[PDB]
């Protein structure tokens, strides 16, 4: 054929990757046990002759 | 022998029943130079007018 050997070339480049939030999937959900974050203690002292709130 | 476009114009050792040929006394194809065209002296626009008409 005419100019056989001058094969057409298909070039790929300039790749870019977006992200689709709606495509989200998750596996098995693990929930840990309650862990003590913090503690505050105190004393309420009543030296009067009546209950105090 | 020289082959046609279908053969991609290949020139290969061989022989054929016809043959390209070139003059043994080639003629020069140079563009002849003619006698000058003389325009009478005048204003620029007048000279151009006489030339283009």
Curated annotation (Swiss-Prot), chain A:
Q: What post-translational changes are documented for it?
A: Proteolytic cleavage and subsequent release of the propeptide trigger a major conformation change, leading to the formation of a heptameric pre-pore that then inserts into the host membrane.
* Superkingdom in the source lineage: Bacteria
Localization terms from the record: Secreted; Host cell membrane
Q: What does this protein do?
A: Secreted, cytolytic toxin that forms pores in host membranes after proteolytic removal of a C-terminal propeptide, leading to destruction of the membrane permeability barrier and host cell death. The pores are formed by transmembrane beta-strands and are approximately 3 nm in diameter.
Record note on domains: The C-terminal propeptide is required for normal protein folding and secretion; it maintains the aerolysin precursor in its soluble form and prevents premature heptamerization and pore formation.
Please state which protein family the record places this protein in: Belongs to the aerolysin family.
Q: How does it assemble?
A: Homodimer in solution; homoheptamer in the host membrane. After binding to GPI-anchored proteins in target membranes and proteolytic removal of the C-terminal propeptide, the protein assembles into a heptameric pre-pore complex. A further conformation change leads to insertion into the host membrane.
Quote the protein name from its UniProt record. Answer: Aerolysin
Q: Which residues of the full protein are shown?
A: 184 to 236 of 493
